[model samples]
Target: MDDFASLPLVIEPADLQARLSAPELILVDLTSAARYAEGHIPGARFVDPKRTQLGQPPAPGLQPPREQLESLFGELGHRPEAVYVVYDDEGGGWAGRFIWLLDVIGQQRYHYLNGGLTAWLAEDRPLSRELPAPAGGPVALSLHDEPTASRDYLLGRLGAADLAIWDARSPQEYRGEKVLAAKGGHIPGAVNFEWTAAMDPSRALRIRTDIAGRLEELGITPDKEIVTHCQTHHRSGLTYLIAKALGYPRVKGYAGSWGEWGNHPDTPVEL
Candidate 1:
């Protein structure tokens, strides 16, 4: 009914079932090779974020080059005008990353399947053991928004009042239970928004209304500048997607997330 039926794309299992009947709809499965091999949705293609984007270090959390992304997305049949949908098994993982990637590169006609494959299966939706090959074509993508916030950026801007650092890590991590990095706590003023909250128990997709309620409780309004991060930005990608879906006016994913921030010796963190 709407031109952008799923802006900040959060698709339900039933909606996915109905939408898949079309020939033009493209579904991108953003999951690991192992999980994808185990099972995936019909007519979906796999896009590995680690191999393609995390082959290097430092700002491994940042978006890939425009030309590389354009080529990869276009070749994979994600045309500039096509209604692209992305999903993954673990919360947003690759799905959320791809969503943030699209936004960074200026592609607006895309969405992420809420609840991912877990919800799809929970609803008894059909599954496919077969995988599709990339379309391999010319793709035009431009990185119009170079918006980025790194550990260094956060360290320099702590308590600036002009910015809000949102830690998308888990409650355990934020509360100092998990210690995967040099620091066990979060940035002093950072807000906790464990990415998994968006998804149901299955951790495959999101419950939009529930997610909205959570954000409202966290004081996440549409008027503030938001920078989200988690363990290595993986979960943060999902958080980024949720923020956009919630209509946050300004949001940025700290690609480095906790991996870089906690590991950085110069970065300041609070327990």
Candidate 2:
């Protein structure tokens, strides 16, 4: 498995196909159950996107309990030495969120299947309807909070010159229209770059080669600390991954997100 250590954090479909049978590789499908039943990459297992979160009221974007996460990974047969590759039909939203969960649990050996199912099928790759039996042992994962940002943490750093907050929501949502919460508009000083902007539709939903430069133009340069969030932290999931993939050294996910920020009486917002 040490050979895989040299692989990049983001892998292409062809590269993934070549390593399909590796014992240390665990393919996770984050698409819907119906899509999974229709067809998926061979040796991949289905994981409900919601299973990745705690789902506590007011804000369900928070990470789940340690015991529950342990059980979830155990049931998936996750091993300390195994490398997980996550993908989904809708770009990398859910898949990226799942990777964030893995990060919270201190598992660093993981990769996002660039373009996910879209690129896989676009390449004429084969899919299997058969379910693979779970193998290996239950994982004992230790939880960490360094990769996450709570509401209070974000509030404290709101006006910090070195902090860059990314709001991965639609322009309408960011501008106080189509509200999904008690309050509308965005977090003050946050930049508006919808998550899909980083994806290239012409390239089968892969991250655009010029994404780093594009982000820098939007004032999201790598020199500053970055914090990303969306309505429920789902869309920002990809933003967080994008920052990491593009070599942004300091990035954090605001799990409470707008769901928590908009509804809280003490929180501030800007149009």
Model 1: residues >4 Å from true position, as ranges? 1-8, 21-23, 65-68, 137-140, 144-147, 202-205
> Which residue runs of candidate 2 sit more than 4 Å off their true CA positions?
136-138
Please give, for residues 1-271, the per-residue lDDT of candidate 1 as tens digits.
Answer: 2344643457676777777745566788877788778888888887876734654566566677666787777767865457777888776767877888777767667777887877877777888888677788657766655445766666777786656677877788998799987678898788887776666774445554667777767766666778888877777888887877677778887887777877788877788
Error of 2 at 17 (Å): 0.5
lDDT of each residue in 113-147, candidate 2, tens digit only: 99999999889899999998866455678888888
What would the TM-scores of all predictions be? 0.86, 0.96
Write down the worst ten-residue block by lDDT for model 1: 1-10
- The alpha-carbon lDDT assigned to residue 103 of candidate 1 equals 76
Top lDDT prediction, candidate number = 2
